């Protein structure tokens, strides 16, 4: 009866591993964040807006570095906020963006690179 206020889902390292291993039709956007990080609030709102924009044409997930610190270090995360744009085609290579990039930048990456 009551819609949920947040569309971006929080996943574990194992769940994200299964998601990446499995077949994907739409681009997958992975957010690395920490609640103690000030810039991550603005990134959280921006990614909520992006998730509203791409209803079923993209998948937005977030990984907390306070629960998956080793997983974040393995994936070459040097700071926060950090975004990973994973294309549905396994042949292609993912893109890592560092910093509070604009929403239009995310739209361009998703449209012309995924």
């Amino acid at each position: 009866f009551v819609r949920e206020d947040y569309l971006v889902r929080k996943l574990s390292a194992q769940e994200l591993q299964d998601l990446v291993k499995g077949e994907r039709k739409v681009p997958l956007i992975v957010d690395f964040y920490a609640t103690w990080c000030g810039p991550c609030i603005l990134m959280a709102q921006e990614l909520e807006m992006l998730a509203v924009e791409y209803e079923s044409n993209a998948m937005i997930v977030k990984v907390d570095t306070d629960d998956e610190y080793e997983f974040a270090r393995d994936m070459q995360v040097r700071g926060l906020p950090t975004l990973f744009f994973i294309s549905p085609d396994p042949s292609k290579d993912a893109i890592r963006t560092e910093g509070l990039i604009p929403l239009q930048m995310m739209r361009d990456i998703i449209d012309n690179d995924m």
Binding site: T35, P39, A72, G79
Partner: peptide, 13 residues
């Protein structure tokens, strides 16, 4: 833009 580099584990999420 922003991007604090120093990241560690915090016990109070």
């Amino acid at each position: 833009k922003e991007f604090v580099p120093v990241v560690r584990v915090h016990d109070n999420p």
